[PDB]
Each structure stands twice: as C-alpha cells, then as structure tokens.
Write a structure and sequence with these properties.
mainly beta; 12 strands; Transcriptional enhancer factor TEF-4; signaling protein
Length: 211
C-alpha cells in the first residue's frame, strides 16, 4: 500500500529535470543537468517525519503543516538532491512529466524558499493529453525563473563546497500539484539540496513524508 517511487495511483512523476543548454548547443547539442529524476520490482521508499522539515517551508497557508493536515497523507514526498553545479547566457530550463489513469487539468505550483520563506513562485496549468489508455501531462522546457538562474550563477562561484552546502542548507523548493477543477492535492514534493562533486553528477533520494 506504501509508495515505491514518487507518485500515487492518481498521478505518477515520469521525469523531472533542471538543466542549462550552452549557447553553442545550436552547433553541437549538449545539456547540463543540475538535478534529474527519471521513473521510466523495487522496495518501499524510506520515510521521514514531516514535522522535522516544517521550519524549512512557509507557514500560515500553502505551508507544509496546513497542506499535510489537508491531505491526503500518501501524496507527500521529500526529495534530497545532490545538485551538479559544474558546467554564459545559455537557456536555463525545467521539464516535468506526469501520468494518470484519469483525465484532469493539473495546477503545478513551485515555491522557491529562503530560510523557509517564499521568495518566488511559479504556477502552471496543464490539460491531460490521452495517449495509449493513460493521460500524460507535459510541462517541458519551462524557462527557469531569473531568481534560480542568478542563484545558480552565484552558488557555482563560491570558493568551497562546504559553503555551497551551508548556503543550500537554507534553500528549499515546495511543489504542490492539484486537480485544478476539484482543488484536491495530487502530489506534494519538498526538495532539499546539497552539491554533488562533479565526478559524481546529479543524484537524488526520495522519501515518503509521514506523521
């Protein structure tokens, strides 16, 4: 009954990535992945108690505690990213793909938070496209908001990766996917971050948020 990947029976994440294509990508295509989840016979995901990360996201409303209280509890995930920050006016982008058995319009809200305070927010809607019995939701090549692009440019220039990790310690992203018509929550993902080491590329670990 417990999740094996990032999804519920109503909405599965297929693929998520944040990337930059250098200006010369036009000559020889390349992209750098800052972070990447691909879910194209596994055990249960580990659990993390949601109370321990409340103070890393906003409060009062659209905050973790109120969202979790709203439910459903099984829709809540924590993703730890080891971001690859080793890669210039190129294209900074975010691509997301989801799948369901039912036809919905999704609202996807992404709240960028600094010391648990909302700083920027992007809200996108996506109508289902029916393909092979299953519905697919494609939010591909969304331009990264200027706050994140500038954050990444500054973060990458820090002299020590322990300082990157100290800065990232206070940097979080909260994603809420709801049925736009019914306002029911489909997927809530809390993102926390560290740097990887370049020889190592982007990595991640997914947890169920429990209470």
């Amino acid at each position: 009954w417990q999740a094996r990947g990032l999804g519920t029976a109503r909405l599965q994440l297929v693929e998520f990535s944040a990337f930059v294509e250098p200006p010369d990508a036009v000559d020889s295509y390349q992209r750098h992945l800052f972070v990447h989840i691909s879910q194209h016979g596994a055990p249960p995901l580990e659990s993390v108690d949601v109370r321990q990360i409340y103070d890393k996201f906003p409060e009062k409303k659209g905050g973790l505690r109120e969202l979790y209280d709203r439910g459903p509890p099984h829709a809540f995930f924590l993703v730890k990213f080891w971001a690859d920050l080793n890669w210039s006016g190129g294209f900074y982008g975010v691509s997301s793909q989801y799948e369901s058995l039912e036809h919905m319009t999704l609202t996807c809200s992404s709240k960028v938070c600094s010391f648990g305070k909302q700083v920027v927010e992007k809200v996108e809607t996506e109508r289902a496209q029916l393909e092979d019995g299953r519905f697919v939701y494609r939010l591909l090549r969304s331009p990264m908001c200027e706050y994140l692009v500038n954050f990444l440019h500054k973060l990458r220039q820090l002299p020590e990766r322990y300082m990157m990790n100290s800065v990232l310690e206070n940097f979080t992203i909260l994603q809420v996917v709801t049925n736009r018509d019914t306002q029911e929550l489909l997927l809530c993902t809390a993102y926390v971050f560290e740097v990887s080491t370049s020889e190592r590329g982007a990595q991640h670990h997914i947890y169920r948020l429990v209470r």
